[PDB]
Design a protein around this nucleic acid. Structure first.
Ligand SMILES: [Mg+2]
Ligand SMILES: [Zn+2]
Lengths: 170, 221, 14, 94, 56, 1112, 55, 101, 147
RNA sequence: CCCUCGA
DNA sequence: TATAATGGGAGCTGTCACGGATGC
DNA sequence: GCATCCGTGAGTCGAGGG
């Protein structure tokens, strides 16, 4: 079991670009909490770290500038999305997170088949790579848009699904 | 432009058998013993089954459900076994420099034993695409050099030469013949099938192999 | 196999 | 996709060497406060705040773009490790 | 007509020829336009769409 | 609104009381209403009769028992977390054989749980359900030997834990072997022990050639029964002294002792019927006049030799046949554990008879009730058939009470259960539902009782049939076992009938499950209804005949996961069971007799009956169920209303006017929508939230204790150190949050202070203390706060104090405080919806009303379902439901379509034409003609072959409407959907899986004691588990540093994780990770195994990972 | 130093006694009223180390 | 007692410091050194000896006074004036307030 | 796999099979310390035979040995990997008796110890790579040039 | 750990 | 610290594949 | 050289409850 991790229900994210995924605001606030504290100290949102953490503790104490600070925190960074069971390596993929309202994780359509993910209620786990090395590995090697073909066959794995096919064929 | 027809033809949803159950007859059914019932469901789902037809179909439905359930666990056990044998195998060097290789045949003996006939395209691809030639191959006025990573066009050209009768089998570097210790070299492995290019040294090829073999384990009927 | 059976036998020796 | 990822994979003999180069360079940029950057002021990666465009805080973005400019030298046994550390501390105080 | 296999081959050939960056852009384009056109297409399922052939 | 029902099949009998399998079983078990002299030898009476008398005072005997009133009512037991139970008293008498002295007294044996009126139990304040078990019926079976063709295995099976299974086989060397407790020995020896002679065996078994000769052994007949008995005792007990009385006792206990070996009453019946004999008792033999007397063995061996030779009238047995599988109901299981506890009490009684004064002994001194109490408690708390009741909606509890499991004590063990046990047998017809069963590992092991099915006294499931004499269908109905059913030709329930006579010359029937076409002269019986083939949940799926069995299973199951909604409605397309499901679940309230309603309140309904008596019914209001769903009864009558017997007084949860209301009826358009219903996702209209459709009440319970410690007492107080008034605002004087206050994550529900552990202040603490000049307080803040992601309005507070009337708590605790928090949940993105046909999906997008596709008259749809779900899933019932729902939308009516009897296509078409007239002639009278977009759509459908060319726009629109399709305009554009779209009313439920419960995230949190790895679970604020396969994933990506982060910095590297957090809050890069702690644990646990594990360098010189702290 | 290998082998009784900081002579765990480790027991602080840091 | 194997997966470790607690103590020591640097070396050292931030224990006024070669009244006055300058600087910058819980 | 429409590359199956053929049985010990019937790795016996042929001695006669995937996993050199796979008791008893050393060659071993795996970015091939900007590189060049 | 329920 | 007292008592079952020793 | 008993295996994550 592991820190800097979360989970939630998944929801279709048609507007997302392939390298993106929708992350609920509260989830991102918790997963990135130390970075958010440090950024709040870099700006005028808090005098120090402990004040900022006590400020985030209660939900009614949370104001609007902390969300912009969190947006600045996650810029360029990626998270790992994983669906159980993990049958091959594409059961974990890397996505730039987009902060969204609501409590559901938003998943890009073209990766669903890889995860064997549909939207009858599946849930997914989120992980935060911490080091520059971990984030570099995730962005170069584990990014969704960098893994387009199956390592088993070599045929396209991210490709048009039934909904996409239905329109283009039509 | 019928919806069922459009979806089935495009590949968005559905296969001829589900379409047949919707529009045609439901078909034959199995007894619990695997034995087949003599009288089939003449009804479709459009028309509606009788309670006897429905009850007869319940046998096969339950049998398939129990099949899937009992299958997932054995598939997972197999996958973990494979991960345990293959995990130390990594691409550790560019070339072990072996002269050994395997010969992928392009023809297989007919079940009639009449002659040899061309293998199915997909199987030739699965045995050739992204591999490295261990010897020079000259076919249809084309030179496929030793050490060449065979692209898909290379495979299709080799198939054309086979159909023209110019080559019956392809020599190729393979993990079976690799003399690299604790792993495999770049030439013997060939492509990184995900990137359609030569494999990067350091790729954990054994785990990829185990997962590639394991993942479609729950589809095996 | 069974320790108390064995001890009871050894006791039944005397 | 990461911008110019194909050219980057072309640069190296193994994708993992690209990863290592990028991560090490990003750590260098973090440690010396981006004062060692080979990017001209117009080539600086930017981020859109509420106020306006500021420097991109992500050192890996910086590292990859620097790598693409051809202005970085990578390889094995280029220079003793402590010598590199001390010279970078000399040219760019921490 | 574009279907599963032809679109798959389009993705593979685009990978080979233009790189994974452009192939990702193409994937997103195909996604967008496919969803858009599927919406307005008129695709639905009614009980009369399961057409029993008289031949049966 | 008007309800039109379809179907030509008139059901002769209604559904039996659906909870009877529980209620009547437990009533039979307790016999609390029966005066003791009239009680039967079944039940707990049977356990008493088996345990007593207790001999070697010398004798303690059982007279009778009684059950007293419960100390507390059901609601009060749920409140104080007690058990709803009744005290058990037993009148016993102690008798000294020599003295003749008789001392008789009634001793208290503890309590027994009482079953509630709906068939559940209250154990420690929690509602629980005892699920029936299915098992191989006791008796004598004969099966084919898998290794030896032509040879057969005889098996004598008693009740579970009532004695061993015995096997009889014909060995390859010819001798007939018996196997008990895994011991193979020649059966001839036991036959000699039973008193048989070679003459009797030769005349009885000689008719079978070459077989009886394997039974002839001269050395066995050369010794009297005593010598053969001691020989058998030496064979069965190596090393044990072969004393005469010891051998007699052992073999008698193995075979003839009814207190030990017991075939079922069903076992005895099946043995008698199979072997064609009569059993005096339920054992295999008897002890009579000092010798053993045979009952079972010889007929069994005769049948075995007969089946082996091939002589007719002898056949092998189907062990999955429902004539050979029976059901152990709640009463039988409770009685089994009662017998166990009673036997322990008897051991205690004899132990107390050895020790103590012999002259002065009373029953009260001999009986220690405790072991019996403990056995019953273990059964009702930690048994596998004792399950936490499902109260999500009333149908949940009803189905839970009608479940059948093959697992449990004495049952099958999973992964040893193959396909045969999970298969649906031909005998499942009418008894066990073929569709309702779990997906996954439990498939075929958990099943459901059929709607008309009944469990008999021997425990077999029986199904009803109608007598048919000379082609005339009577109203006489007979409930049959599968064994009885296989004797008749039984026609189908849809068989055409003019009056009571069969009107078809070719009739569909079954003979031993085999379908056959048969004359009316050949028909012996006929089905009661199609409903008898399926469970209750499966009977709630309209158009079931149009649904593939898998999605039928899914809808059937998901109906129990339906959340009661504040505005919940009964479906517009019903199957006709929806009223009985409410009535038999005891969800709603009904009139006991005719009368006039005196008073009507949100709290009580007072009714004056024809007797003149005034009865006051209180209404359960906003009660929290086991799953947190709200249970409240709303009054459905008004003051002065004249009510008859059985009329509805008040609606229970998930009930609309006595009809089952598991969800909402929404207007549905089947079409893709810009990828937001991609892969079973669902799109909904914001209007659904505006009128509070799919909005539910959920209550959560929070609990805290104040206890006495060694460092001083914990106490609940409003005085909490270092806290402002803003944080204590909603706390009352005692430290408990006030009723009605809104609580958010972090708010204090109950203030509590605890004395600090003995603290040596670190020098930083001392210096800071001297700087700010403030004494560190004695206590610290332990208050109970709202967990992350929870909150709402406080509706209840319960406080239980020690030293107060009626309150005594666990040792050491001073007081207990409970806070109840209710929340109103709107449907939101991530919540789960489903229909009754297996179509399930998560709400991915909520559109503003102006974005929804809408009808030409401006009416927007509610939910947009993607059609791609339909073809592969093959569940067309939802389609027909949508068509008929469109019809009922415009006609303002609802429909009852019984399964396999429901509305056909032409009748739906007639209703759709009637609806089209309302939908269109209204427009044509309002002064509006056809719209241009409608014309364009009509051209497209004319190209599609949906409408006939040349007809007027109205005729083509009606043609489309009869196909269920209408013209739909995109709300964003105003341009129509190029084709016509199926739109209609559909019944959709909001399932219990809501994202609000499931969303969780953690940066850092608690760690486990030994592993020093993050805890698991959302409530403990745990981390996600990165398992073996996720490690494989990261390995396959070749992402070494991400993996090493998972293995050290984020889990169990203490130094690493502390350094990482500090580096990140400082703004630095995370440091190199250290050694994971659980590997040090591995090293130490291997050392305790006497195994030295050394971490070495490349020079093979040891490296110390414990940093010297483990070396002397 | 860096760990390059991991070895496993049998443990001599002398090696076992070399590991040990003391012999446990009593089957006692903690005192019933003081809740502190009993002397020469399975939880003795004399053998396995202090319960509190630097105390 | 009851068994951990009927359970222990729900049992957290209250003994070892959480990463947040350890980071708080680290920032506390660092901020105390930051505020002690604003004093002279002698008065800061007297405060560290009297509160035990050097060898772990608190010396009396006699031991610190004989360490610096001075009277116990003098070393107590040094402690007082150092505490006073600390109180002034803390009222000014309000840096050490948050650590008081 | 073909029967179910699963396109899977041969080389993965070849990796696995290669691991199934990993071992050999001695038919004659020759001049070695090996025993008849002793099972060992093909690599080890080939190295031993090249050492004996380079020494002028008689090589070891051996026979190929096909063992199933589980037996090939349990017979690997790393006792950490085998003990973590299954039959932990057997593996551990034989390894402790033999006094076996795990060289930490594969992935499982380094995962247990929580080390950086010998694959991908952890590969010794790519992990020692250095990065330097031209300014710092020329400054270091001048530092080397002065001495 | 067991049961049940999700994927 | 004294009548004499002297060999226990729960059992419990519908899997399968492999290695290994054990027994004709 | 061939049967028979004994030990060891038999998917993951998640939730909830006792
Ligand atoms: Mg799913
Ligand atoms: Zn090689």
């Amino acid at each position: 079991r592991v820190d800097y991790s979360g989970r939630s229900v998944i929801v279709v994210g048609p507007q997302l670009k392939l390298h993106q995924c929708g992350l609920p605001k509260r989830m991102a606030l918790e997963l990135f909490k130390p970075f958010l504290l440090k950024k709040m100290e870099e700006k005028g949102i808090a005098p120090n770290v402990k004040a900022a953490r006590r400020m985030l503790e209660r939900q009614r104490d949370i104001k609007d500038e902390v969300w912009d600070a969190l947006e600045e925190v996650i810029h360029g960074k990626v998270v790992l999305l994983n669906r159980a069971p993990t049958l091959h390596r594409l059961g974990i993929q890397a996505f730039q997170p987009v902060l969204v309202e609501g409590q559901s994780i938003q998943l890009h359509p073209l990766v669903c088949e890889a995860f064997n993910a549909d939207f009858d209620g599946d849930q997914m786990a989120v992980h935060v790579p911490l080091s520059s090395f971990a984030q570099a590995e995730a962005r170069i090697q584990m990014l969704s848009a960098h893994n387009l073909l199956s390592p088993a066959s070599g045929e396209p794995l991210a490709k048009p699904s039934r909904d996409i096919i239905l329109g283009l064929y039509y | 432009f019928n919806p069922l027809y459009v979806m089935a033809q495009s590949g968005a949803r559905g296969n001829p058998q589900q379409i047949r159950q919707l529009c045609g007859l439901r078909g034959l059914m199995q007894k619990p013993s695997g034995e087949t019932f003599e009288v089939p469901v003449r009804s479709s789902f459009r028309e509606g089954l009788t309670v006897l037809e429905y009850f007869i179909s319940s046998h096969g439905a339950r049998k398939g459900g129990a099949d899937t359930a009992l299958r997932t666990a054995d598939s997972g056990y197999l996958t973990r076994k494979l991960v345990d044998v293959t995990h130390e195998i990594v691409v550790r060097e560019a070339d072990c420099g072996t002269t050994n290789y395997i010969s992928v045949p392009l023809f297989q003996p007919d079940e009639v034993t009449r002659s040899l006939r061309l293998r199915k395209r997909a199987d030739i691809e699965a045995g050739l695409y992204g591999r490295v030639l261990a010897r020079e191959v000259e076919v249809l006025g084309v030179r496929l050099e030793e050490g060449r990573y065979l692209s898909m066009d290379d495979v299709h050209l080799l198939i054309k030469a086979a159909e023209a009768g110019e080559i019956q089998e392809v020599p190729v570097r393979s993990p079976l013949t690799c003399q690299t210790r604790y792993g495999v070299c770049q030439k013997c492995y060939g492509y990184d099938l995900s990137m359609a290019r030569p494999v990067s040294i350091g790729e954990a090829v054994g785990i990829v192999a185990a997962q590639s073999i394991g993942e479609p384990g729950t589809q095996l009927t | 196999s069974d320790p108390v059976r064995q001890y009871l036998h050894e006791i039944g020796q005397v | 996709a990461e911008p110019g990822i194909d050219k980057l994979f072309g640069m190296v003999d193994s994708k993992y060497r690209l990863t290592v180069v990028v991560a090490k360079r990003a750590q260098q940029l973090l440690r010396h406060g981006f004062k060692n950057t080979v990017l001209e002021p117009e080539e600086r990666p930017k981020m859109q705040t509420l106020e306006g465009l500021f420097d991109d805080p992500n050192a890996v973005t910086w590292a990859m773009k620097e790598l693409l400019t051809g202005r970085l030298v990578f390889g094995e046994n280029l220079v003793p490790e402590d010598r590199l550390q001390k010279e970078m501390e000399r040219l760019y105080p921490v | 007509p574009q279907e599963k296999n032809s679109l798959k081959d389009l993705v593979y050939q685009a990978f080979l020829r233009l790189g994974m960056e452009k192939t990702a852009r193409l994937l997103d384009a195909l996604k967008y336009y496919g969803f858009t056109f599927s919406t307005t297409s008129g695709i639905t399922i009614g009980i009369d769409d399961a057409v029993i052939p008289e031949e049966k | 609104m008007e309800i039109k029902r379809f179907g030509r099949i008139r059901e002769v009998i209604p559904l039996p009381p659906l909870t009877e399998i529980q209620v009547e079983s437990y009533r039979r078990a307790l016999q609390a209403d029966v005066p003791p002299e009239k009680r039967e030898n079944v039940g707990i009476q049977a356990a008493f009769r088996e345990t007593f008398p207790i001999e070697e005072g010398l004798v303690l005997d059982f007279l009778e028992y009684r059950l007293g009133e419960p100390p507390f009512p059901q609601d009060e037991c749920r409140e104080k977390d007690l058990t709803y139970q009744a005290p058990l008293y037993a009148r016993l008498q102690l008798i000294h054989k020599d003295t003749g002295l008789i001392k008789e007294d009634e001793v208290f044996l503890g309590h027994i749980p009482l079953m509630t009126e709906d068939g559940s139990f209250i154990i420690n304040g929690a509602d629980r359900v005892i699920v029936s078990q299915i098992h191989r019926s006791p008796g004598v079976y004969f099966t084919p030997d898998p290794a030896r063709p032509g040879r057969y295995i005889a098996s004598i099976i008693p009740l579970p834990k009532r004695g061993p299974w015995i096997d009889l086989e014909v060995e390859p060397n010819g001798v007939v072997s018996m196997k008990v407790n895994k011991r193979k020995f020649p059966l001839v020896l036991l036959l000699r022990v039973l008193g048989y002679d070679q003459e009797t065996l030769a005349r009885e078994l000689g008719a079978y050639g070459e077989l009886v000769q394997g039974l002839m052994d001269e050395s066995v007949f050369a010794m009297r029964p005593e010598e053969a008995l001691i020989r058998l005792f030496t064979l069965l007990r190596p090393g044990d002294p072969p004393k005469r009385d010891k051998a007699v006792a052992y073999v008698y206990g193995l075979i003839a002792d009814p207190r030990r070996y017991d075939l079922g009453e069903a076992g005895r019946y099946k043995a008698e019927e199979k072997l064609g004999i009569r059993l005096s008792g339920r054992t295999l033999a008897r002890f009579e006049d000092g010798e053993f007397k045979d009952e079972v063995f010889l007929p069994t061996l005769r049948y075995l030799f007969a089946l082996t030779a091939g002589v007719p009238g002898h056949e092998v047995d189907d062990i999955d046949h429902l004539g050979n599988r029976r059901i152990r109901t709640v009463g039988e299981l409770m009685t089994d554990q009662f017998r166990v506890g009673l036997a322990r009490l008897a051991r205690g009684v004899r132990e107390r008879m050895l020790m103590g004064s012999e002259d002065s002994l009373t029953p009260a001194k001999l009986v220690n009730s405790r072991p019996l109490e403990a056995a019953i408690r273990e059964f009702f708390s930690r048994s596998q058939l004792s399950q936490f009741k499902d109260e999500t909606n009333p149908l949940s509890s009803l189905r839970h009470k009608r479940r059948i499991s093959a697992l449990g004590p004495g049952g099958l063990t999973r992964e040893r259960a193959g396909f045969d046990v999970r298969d649906v047998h031909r005998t499942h017809y009418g008894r066990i539902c073929p569709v309702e069963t779990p997906e996954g590992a439990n498939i075929g092991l958990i099943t459901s009782l059929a709607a008309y099915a009944r469990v008999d006294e021997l425990g077999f499931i029986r199904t009803p049939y109608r007598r048919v004499v000379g082609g005339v269908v009577t109203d006489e109905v007979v409930y049959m076992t599968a064994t009885e059913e296989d004797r008749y030709t039984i026609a189908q329930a849809n068989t055409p009938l003019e009056g009571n006579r069969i009107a078809a010359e070719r009739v569909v029937a079954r003979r031993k499950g085999e379908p056959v076409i048969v004359s009316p002269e050949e028909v012996e019986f006929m089905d009661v209804s199609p409903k008898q083939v399926f469970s209750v949940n499966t009977n709630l799926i309209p158009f079931l005949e149009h649904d593939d069995a898998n999605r039928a299973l899914m809808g059937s199951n998901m109906q129990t996961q339906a959340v009661p909604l504040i505005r919940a409605q009964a479906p517009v397309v019903m199957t006709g069971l929806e009223e009985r499901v409410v009535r038999d679940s005891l969800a709603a309230l009904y009139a006991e007799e005719d009368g006039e309603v005196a008073k009507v309140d949100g709290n009580r309904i007072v009714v004056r009956y024809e007797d003149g008596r005034l009865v006051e019914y209180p209404l359960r209001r906003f009660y929290r169920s086991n799953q947190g769903t709200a249970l409240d009864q709303r009054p459905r009558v008004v003051v002065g209303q004249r009510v008859r017997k059985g009329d509805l007084l008040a609606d229970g949860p998930a009930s609309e006017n006595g009809f089952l209301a598991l969800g909402q009826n929404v207007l549905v358009a089947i079409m893709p929508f810009d990828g937001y219903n991609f892969e079973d996702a669902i799109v909904i209209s914001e209007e659904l939230l505006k009128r509070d459709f799919y909005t539910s009440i959920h209550i959560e319970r929070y609990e805290i204790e104040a206890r006495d410690t060694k460092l001083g007492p914990e106490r609940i107080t409003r005085d909490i150190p270092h806290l402002s008034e803003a944080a204590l605002r909603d706390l009352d004087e005692e430290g408990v949050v006030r009723i009605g206050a809104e609580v958010k994550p972090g708010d204090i529900l109950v203030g509590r202070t605890s004395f600090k552990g003995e603290s040596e202040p670190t020098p930083e603490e001392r210096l800071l203390r001297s700087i700010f000049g403030e004494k560190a307080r004695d206590v610290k803040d332990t208050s109970l706060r709202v967990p992350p992601g929870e909150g709402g309005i406080v509706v209840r507070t319960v406080r239980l104090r020690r030293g107060d009337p009626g309150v005594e708590l666990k040792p050491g605790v001073r007081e207990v405080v409970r806070v109840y928090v209710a929340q109103k949940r709107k449907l939101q993105v991530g919540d789960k919806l489903a229909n009754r046909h297996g179509n399930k999906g998560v709400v991915a997008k909520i559109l503003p009303v102006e974005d929804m596709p809408h009808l030409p008259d401006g009416t927007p749809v509610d939910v947009i379902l993607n059609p791609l779900g339909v073809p592969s899933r093959m569940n067309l019932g939802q389609i027909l439901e949508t068509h008929l729902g469109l019809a009922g939308y415009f006609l303002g009516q609802r429909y009852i379509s019984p399964i396999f009897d429901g509305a056909k296509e032409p009748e739906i078409k007639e209703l759709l034409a009637q609806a089209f007239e309302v939908y269109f002639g209204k427009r044509k009278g309002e002064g509006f003609g056809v719209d241009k977009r409608e014309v364009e759509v009509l051209r497209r459908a004319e190209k599609l072959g949906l409408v006939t060319p040349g007809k007027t726009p109205e005729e083509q629109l009606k043609e489309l409407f009869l196909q269920g399709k209408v013209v739909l305009y995109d709300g964003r554009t105003g341009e129509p959907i190029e084709g016509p779209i199926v739109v209609g009313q559909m019944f959709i439920m909001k399932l219990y899986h809501m994202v609000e419960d499931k969303m969780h995230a953690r940066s850092t949190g608690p760690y486990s004691l030994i592993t020093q790895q993050p805890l698991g679970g959302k409530a403990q604020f745990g981390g996600q588990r990165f398992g073996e396969m996720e490690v494989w994933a990261l390995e396959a990506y070749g992402a070494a540093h991400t993996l090493q982060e998972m293995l050290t910095l984020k889990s169990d590297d203490i130094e690493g994780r502390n350094a990482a957090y500090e580096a990140i809050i400082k703004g630095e890069d995370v440091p190199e990770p250290s050694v994971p702690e659980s590997f040090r644990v591995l090293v130490k646990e291997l050392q305790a195994l006497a195994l030295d594990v050394q971490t070495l360098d490349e020079k093979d010189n040891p490296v110390d990972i414990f940093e010297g702290l483990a070396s002397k | 130093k860096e760990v390059r290998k991991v070895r496993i082998a049998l443990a001599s009784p002398e090696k076992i006694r070399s590991w040990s900081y003391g012999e446990v002579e009593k089957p006692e765990t903690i005192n019933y009223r003081t809740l502190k480790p009993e002397r020469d027991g399975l939880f003795d602080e004399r053998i396995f180390g202090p319960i509190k840091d630097y105390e | 007692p009851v068994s951990l194997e009927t359970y222990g997966d729900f049992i957290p470790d209250e003994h070892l410091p959480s990463p947040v607690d350890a980071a708080t103590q680290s920032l506390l020591s660092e901020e105390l050194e930051k505020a002690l640097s604003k004093l002279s070396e002698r008065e800061a050292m007297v405060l560290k000896l009297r509160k035990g931030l050097i060898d772990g224990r608190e010396h009396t006024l006699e031991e610190v006074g004989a360490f610096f070669g001075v009277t116990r009244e003098r070393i107590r006055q040094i402690e007082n004036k150092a505490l006073r300058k600390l109180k002034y600087h803390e009222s000014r910058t309000r840096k050490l307030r948050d650590f008081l819980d | 796999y073909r029967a179910q429409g699963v396109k899977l590359h041969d080389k993965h199956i070849e990796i696995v099979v290669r691991q199934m053929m990993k071992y050999v049985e001695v038919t004659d010990p020759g001049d070695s310390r090996l025993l008849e019937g002793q099972v060992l790795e093909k690599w080890d016996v080939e190295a031993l035979n090249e050492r004996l042929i380079a020494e002028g001695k008689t090589p070891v006669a051996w026979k190929p040995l096909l063992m199933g995937v589980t037996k090939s996993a349990l017979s690997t050199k790393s006792w950490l990997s085998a003990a973590s796979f299954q039959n932990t008791t057997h593996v551990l008893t034989e390894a402790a008796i033999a006094g076996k050393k795990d060289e930490l060659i594969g992935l499982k071993e380094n995962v247990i110890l929580g080390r950086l795996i010998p694959a991908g970015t952890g590969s010794d091939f790519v992990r020692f790579t250095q990065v330097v900007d031209q300014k710092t590189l020329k400054a270091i060049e001048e530092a080397r040039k002065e001495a």
